[PDB]
Paper text:
Among the most important influenza virus targets is the RNA-dependent RNA polymerase acidic N-terminal (PAN) endonuclease, which is a critical component of the viral replication machinery. PAN is part of a heterotrimeric RNA-dependent RNA polymerase complex, which is composed of PA, PB1, and PB2 subunits. The PA subunit, which enables endonucleolytic cleavage, is composed of a C-terminal domain that is mostly structural and an N-terminal domain that is catalytically active. In native PAN, the Mn2+ cations are coordinated by His41, Glu80, Asp108, Glu 119, and Ile120 and five water molecules, producing an octahedral coordination geometry at each metal center.
To account for the electronic and lipophilic effects of adding this bromine substituent, a direct analog of 1 was synthesized that contains a bromine atom (2). Compound 2 was used as a control to determine whether the addition of a bromine atom negatively affected the metal-binding ability of the MBP. As anticipated, the addition of a bromine atom to the MBIs produced no apparent change in the binding to the active site metal ions (compare structures of 1 and 2) and aided in ligand placement within the electron density map. Both compounds 1 and 2 coordinated by bridging the metal ions through the phenolate donor. Compounds 1, 2, 3, and 5 present the same triad and display similar binding poses, coordinating Mn1 through the ketone and Mn2 through the carboxylate, with the hydroxyl group bridging Mn1 and Mn2.21 The binding and inhibitory activity (vide infra) of these compounds are comparable to those of the parent MBP 1. Compounds 1 and 2 showed similar inhibition activity, indicating that the bromide did not impact metal-binding relative to the parent compound. Both compounds display high binding energy per atom (ligand efficiency, LE). Using a pH-metric titration, the measured pKa value of compound 2 was measured at 9.79 ± 0.01, showing reasonable agreement with the DFT calculation.
Residue numbers in the entry: -1 to 52, 73 to 197
The structure:
Amino acid sequence: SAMEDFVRQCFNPMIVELAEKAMKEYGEDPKIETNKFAAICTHLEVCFMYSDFGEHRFEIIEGRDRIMAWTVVNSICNTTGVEKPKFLPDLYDYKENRFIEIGVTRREVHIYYLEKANKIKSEKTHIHIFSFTGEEMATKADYTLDEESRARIKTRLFTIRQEMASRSLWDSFRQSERE
Ligand SMILES: O=C(O)c1[nH]c(Br)cc(=O)c1O
Ligand SMILES: [Mn+2]
Ligand SMILES: [Mn+2]
């Protein structure tokens, strides 16, 4: 276990339940794919944090089931004209009027940024990558959030990494490229 216990102790029950739903839909067991379990939990929490740091600025798309997520995306596109994205993004920014793809990587932020940008192939989806070392990379170096919110996200990620390290789980996670 170990990784399972750490996930249950460091993430709130709602996030853990959402991640378990994601993995049960993928056909993957969270007791076997422990690293993917933790990665999904971390990504969900970063998305929720990003959103909470907003007159209601961000619409959360991640964390919903596919049907609801695409319903939300379609409503946004129909009421703003913003082009519908090819792949499901993570948030929508009502202030900048643009979708946001959030990335959390155990590798260098620029490697994962290139990977995500090559993947999404949509010039209009904004991309924000965070690492577990306090580094970030965003489209056009536009980081959207203010310094304090980004710092809180960075601190949470670093703290997750250090919690894993104290439990001897960081090495496997970092090499597990489940992201
Ligand atoms: O939306 C998704 O399904 C998704 N999948 C991976 Br893999 C990494 C992400 O950041 C993300 O948002
Ligand atoms: Mn997503
Ligand atoms: Mn994402």
